Each structure stands twice: as structure tokens, then as C-alpha cells.
């Protein structure tokens, strides 16, 4: 008997396309994104060129729109160079992206005035998600009350960090997190396995202490979203190793695990991976639209998963139980049993829907 | 300029049909609904005979459908003699209803221990809700932790009962809440005005501490709903005045003069009336379904509004700026302008819906 479960949302991923495409690109990530449940994608703007600009957003607008086989929206990134300029395309993106901490030369902001250059001229009604890690989540946390806005934390990944946010909620601050899987089934344990290489990943792994302080704090956490952070195995095992993981194929298999052991409930998923991205990013529902997934079915992950062009995995080993079987996008069959079977080009911006904009006075 | 908002979901009304159809029945208040900008509303169960059977749900349900204007969904009542016998039909409901504090003969409890065992035989994936005033909510709360599930606190009134919330929500314990819009725009100054007849609701009427409280911690409500609990005038103005106001007509209004005097934003708005029922009590979207407002138009509540039956409003006489304009529902115009042009029959159960039922481990 399989359950039925809605359109899943990851509000983070980077798909790599445009200049990274050997890594992933719109059809084979969302192709990724389809066999792990997920119907909608929000990618991050740090591609080369980076979506810093409205030609660069309409660029890859174009490119997803050609490619992309499940639903998406964009996301604009924040630069040293670009507060002041994004009004006019602002609606039309996911939300603005800051990069608080180790970044590429164009999203990187050297200081704390920029942070608050961008809160105040992005518009007030449109989300702001930050890579802020440690005392960043503090300090951004304070431009955002400064500035009287709301602001979402990304990849929450340490017992600091999401006891900062836990502390931040209870003063009534406007403050939502998400919490990628990694953080929630890997840690300091699994380097030895991993090696320093394929082991990099901002935020990096944390100790059991942290792991056990996310589980614990589970009604903190509003969101997962995978960052799915494709690079090849030769990038990874390489001189320079990029961080980050891919991780769309097995963000729900591994939940699902969880759900299955009593660790969360299904509720505790869905509100996670579907009403909280939905209500946070103002995303619209998808029409016949939904996820089919069997609770049963043990397995265990393999050294890469079928459609993401990492062709790698740091979850290799693990045993999971739950596996999705057919996902329905928009009333077509979009994935099957290790098959997808919509095209690239089959997906939409989801921003361009009359119910994809975010309501604004006039 | 008109703003387009989605369809608003209030989750708690009284429609009073069957029983009670002088006061109000499914045709008048969910014209009322819709005249409100309500596009989906979940009824509550103390009709005659209340909805505390299968029986009772089945009549319920084919009255509704026969006369809804708009979509809905139907709350199964907790009595002394039902806890373990809704299991067939609980899944059909909006939730379960407990009236912890007064209430009829019905749906009267008389022992913490008679709300154990529906806290025990309910779905636990299914919701509850319960009128729990002053100590009552911490009472319930106790209970929903020892059978380890969540709870919905319908229409916190007080001080007391949002900062008792609000410590609960610190502890991570699965609470939400409601406020309807008599305790956030009216107060113990405006009873001279009403009278003790008038007046009389339950909750009752805080103090303006107890609003200033409400609104000081917005943060802590999760949803906005009407209690939209009409009765006539005689009977209001009578020997034994039933509690309650009608307020469906008067809740978005008062709300949007809020929103325009920068008291909450549009965002806290629709999380509260929009995001935040869905996911709640996992109630599906509505497609090709939006609210059309002006944000401008300045008026006065008039001593009755045109469509609940109730023929009165404890308002009359408040200044509020903001007014819908139009509500089209699923592909059709259901209200311009003062004119409701959907007939009774149009609305449907939500909870038949492929996307309404409410997600579960098989
Ligand atoms: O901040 C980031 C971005 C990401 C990427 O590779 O784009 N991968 C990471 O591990 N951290
Ligand atoms: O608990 C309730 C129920 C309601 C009604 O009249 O049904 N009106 C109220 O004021 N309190
Ligand atoms: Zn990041
Ligand atoms: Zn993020
Ligand atoms: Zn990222
Ligand atoms: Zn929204
Ligand atoms: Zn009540
Ligand atoms: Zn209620
Ligand atoms: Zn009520
Ligand atoms: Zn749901």
C-alpha cells in the first residue's frame, strides 16, 4: 500500500546551469528532483554568470524553462554592486540570496553595510534567505530587526546556531530555518569514511552533539531543503575540492527512514517539505500534482544515484527504508520506478503563475 | 487598484443547520462567507442534533452540499458517549471539536479523563481543537502531552491564554492557536455601548490589557477565524441571550484597516487567514480561486450586514477602511460588489477532494 503525499518543495538547490553544467544541469537535476519526490525547486543564483542581474535572470529563466522537468523559481543573489538595481525583476524570483560567508568574488559582500544596503532596498514583502553560519546567523538576524523585516536562515547546521534561532523565536522575531539531511544523518563520525575531500561541505559536518541538538529541536526547524551541491567526483576527490553534496535523491528516502523509526511523523515531514516552503517563499500549489511512495521497501543507498551528474553520494552505505514510486506533475506521469518520463522543458516558472506572485500593497 | 488575495479559510464557524436555521443556515452564512472574502470555512458541530454521530455527520453532510456557496469542511463534536466509535468516519471531518468550558447537555464533558480517552481513540494524524478558556487551556495542554499529540486552541481571548501559548511554543510542545476579531477590536470599554445581552460571547469580552496583549504577541497566533456564532437579535436582546456575534462579513474588513494602519502586514495577514489553516487542518488549495479587495474605501459598519441572519453586528459603528470587491471561486464569480452569484449547492466538501484527505502511515 503506497502513501500519497503532496508536491514536495526544496527551496535549495543549485542546479548548476548556467557554466557549471558538467556538475548537473536544469534536465538532469530536476530529473534528480523528480526521483526524490520533488515537484518544485527553488535554485541559487551563484551559476557563471551569477543571477546577479536582470540579463543574467533572464538568461536563466530561458534556460530553465527549456530544461527544467519539475516546477522552479529562481533566485536572485546580493553582490557588492547590485542593491538599489534589482526592483524591477524582484517579483519574479524565488527572493534575494545572501552569501554571508566564503563565497565566489560576485556574491560576496565585504561588509556589514551591504547586508543592510540589501534589506532595505529589496522589497520588504519578498524573501530573504542567507548562508550565515555560527555568529553570521546573529549578526544577520540583527540587520533584519534593524531594518524591521523577516529573514530566513539556511542550512541550520550546529547546536549554536539553531539554539540562536530557538532564542530568537521566542523573543517573537520574524526569524525561519531550514536543515539539510546531511546535518541531520551525517556528522564528524563519517569523515574518516568520507576523507577530507568528498567530506567538504559549508556548513561543514557537525559533531553528534550538533546532530542530536537538531533532532532535538525539531520544532525550530521550519523548512529541509537539501542544498544540493553537485560536483564530480574528480572535482571533489581533486587539488581544491568544492563543498557540498548533492542531495536530492536521497533527502526523502532518508526522512522517510526517520518517519519510519518514530524519529518525526509524517506531519512533521510535510509540514517541512511542502506547507512551510509553501507559506514562507509564497509558492503556489501545483494542480494534480503528487507524490506516491512506498514506507516498506528496504534498501540500501548506493555509491551514486541514478540521474544527478555528481555521480556520488556521501550517504553510500546507509540503510534506508522508503522509496518514492510514482510522482504526477501537473496531471502527467513525471517519474516512475527509476524512469522519469516527462522531458526537459516540461517544468515552470513558477513566478509567472497569477498564483505564483507575492501579494503586495499597491 | 484592486490586490488579489488567495481564497481565505476561516476554521470556525457556526452555520447552524441543522436545527438552528432561523439563526443562520449553510446558504445565508456562507454568503456571508464569501462577502467576507471567505472562500472555505470549517462549521462547527453544535448544531441540532450536533454532529457527535455518523448519522448526524451524514445529514450534516448532504445539507452543507445542498446549500454551501462556498467550500467547506465539517467538524465532528466530542461527547460523553463517542470516544472510540468516529474512527470510521473521522477522517471525513475537518477534526475533532472538544467544548471543554459551557456547552449543551451534548457536548458537555465532565471529566479530564472523558478528554484522555478522545486524545487516545482520535486519529492521531487527525486534528483537535478545543474551547479551552483561562486554566483549561494549560489542562488540555497536559493532556495532549501525556497521549503525545498536538492540540488547536480556538479563540485565545486573554493575557492569560497567549502567554501561557507562548511558553508552551518555547518548550517545542505541538500547539496552535487562533484570536477572532472581537477580542483583537473590541474590549470590556465597548460594553456600555452593547449592553449585557449584546455583549454576551465566549469568550468573553477581555480588557483592553488582554488586547494589547493579543496584539503585542502576534507572533504566538497562528490563525485568524471569525467564531462567526450568529443569533437573532431577539434572542440576543432577550431573557437568556445566547453568546456569541456573527462576524464573518466583518472579519477581513476590520483586519484590513489593521494592515493599513501598519498594526500587522499583508504577509502576517495571509499566513494567518491562508497559509496557516492549511496546514493546520491539512485542508487542500482551491483552484482558480482568489479575493479581490480595495484597500481604499472608507465606511462604516452599519447596525446589521447584508447576509447572516444574525441581523446584527457588534461592530456597527467602527470606522474601516478596506472592502471586497470580488471573489471568483473555482473558475466562477461568487460575489461582486454586494451581490453573491453562486447559487446554495455550488460549495463542496473539501475533505472529498483527492488533495483534502489528510495524509497517513497505512
Ligand atoms: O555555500 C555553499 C554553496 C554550495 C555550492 O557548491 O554551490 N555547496 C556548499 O557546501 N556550500
Ligand atoms: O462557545 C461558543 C459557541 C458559540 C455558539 O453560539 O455556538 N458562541 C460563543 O460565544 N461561544
Ligand atoms: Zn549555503
Ligand atoms: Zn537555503
Ligand atoms: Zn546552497
Ligand atoms: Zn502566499
Ligand atoms: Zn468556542
Ligand atoms: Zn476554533
Ligand atoms: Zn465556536
Ligand atoms: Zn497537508
Redesign the pocket.
Known amino acids: 500500500k503506497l502513501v500519497r503525499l503532496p508536491g514536495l518543495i526544496d527551496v535549495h538547490v ?1 542546479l ?1 546551469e548556467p557554466g557549471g553544467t558538467h556538475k548537473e544541469d536544469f534536465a538532469s537535476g530536476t530529473a534528480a528532483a523528480l526521483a526524490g519526490g520533488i515537484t518544485m525547486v527553488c535554485a ?1 543564483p ?1 551559476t557563471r554568470p551569477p543571477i546577479i542581474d536582470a540579463p543574467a535572470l533572464a538568461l536563466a529563466q530561458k534556460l530553465a524553462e527549456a530544461g527544467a522537468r519539475c516546477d522552479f523559481a529562481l533566485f536572485l543573489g546580493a553582490s557588492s554592486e547590485n542593491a538599489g538595481t534589482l526592483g524591477t525583476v524582484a517579483g519574479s524570483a524565488a527572493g534575494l540570496k545572501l ?1 554571508l ?3 565566489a568574488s560576485e556574491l560576496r559582500l565585504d561588509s556589514v553595510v551591504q547586508w543592510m544596503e540589501h534589506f532595505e532596498t529589496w522589497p520588504s514583502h519578498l524573501p530573504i534567505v542567507a ?1 550565515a553560519e555560527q555568529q553570521t546567523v546573529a549578526a544577520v538576524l540583527m540587520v533584519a530587526q534593524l531594518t524591521q523585516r523577516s529573514v530566513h536562515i ?2 541550520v547546521a550546529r547546536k549554536e546556531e539553531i539554539l540562536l534561532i530557538k532564542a530568537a523565536k521566542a523573543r517573537g522575531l520574524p526569524v525561519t530555518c531550514e536543515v539539510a539531511p546531511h546535518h541531520l544523518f551525517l556528522s564528524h563520525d563519517d569523515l574518516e569514511r568520507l576523507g577530507p575531500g568528498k567530506g ?4 561543514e559536518l557537525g559533531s553528534r552533539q550538533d546532530v542530536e541538538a537538531l533532532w532535538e529541536n525539531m520544532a525550530v526547524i521550519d523548512c529541509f531543503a537539501s ?1 544540493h ?3 564530480t567526483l574528480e572535482e571533489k576527490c581533486g587539488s581544491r575540492p ?4 548533492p542531495g536530492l535523491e536521497t533527502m526523502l528516502p532518508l526522512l522517510l527512514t526517520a518517519v519510519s523509526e518514530g524519529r518525526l511523523s509524517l506531519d512533521d515531514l510535510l509540514q517541512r517539505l511542502h506547507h512551510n516552503p509553501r507559506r514562507i517563499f509564497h509558492l503556489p500549489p501545483q494542480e494534480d500534482t503528487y507524490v506516491e511512495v512506498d514506507l516498506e521497501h528496504e534498501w540500501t543507498i548506493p555509491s551514486h544515484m541514478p540521474f544527478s551528474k555528481a555521480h556520488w553520494t556521501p550517504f553510500e552505505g546507509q540503510k534506508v527504508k522508503g522509496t518514492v514510486r510514482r510522482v504526477v506533475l501537473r496531471g502527467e506521469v513525471a517519474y516512475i520506478d527509476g524512469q522519469v518520463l516527462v522531458p526537459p522543458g516540461y517544468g515552470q516558472d513558477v513566478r509567472k503563475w497569477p498564483q505564483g506572485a507575492v501579494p503586495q500593497l499597491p
Not at 568544492?242 to 553534496?245: A, D, Q
Open positions: 543549485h548548476r541559487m551563484n552569501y560567508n566564503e563565497t548562508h539556511c542550512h567538504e561541505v559549508r556548513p542544498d551541491a553537485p560536483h568544492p563543498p557540498g553534496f
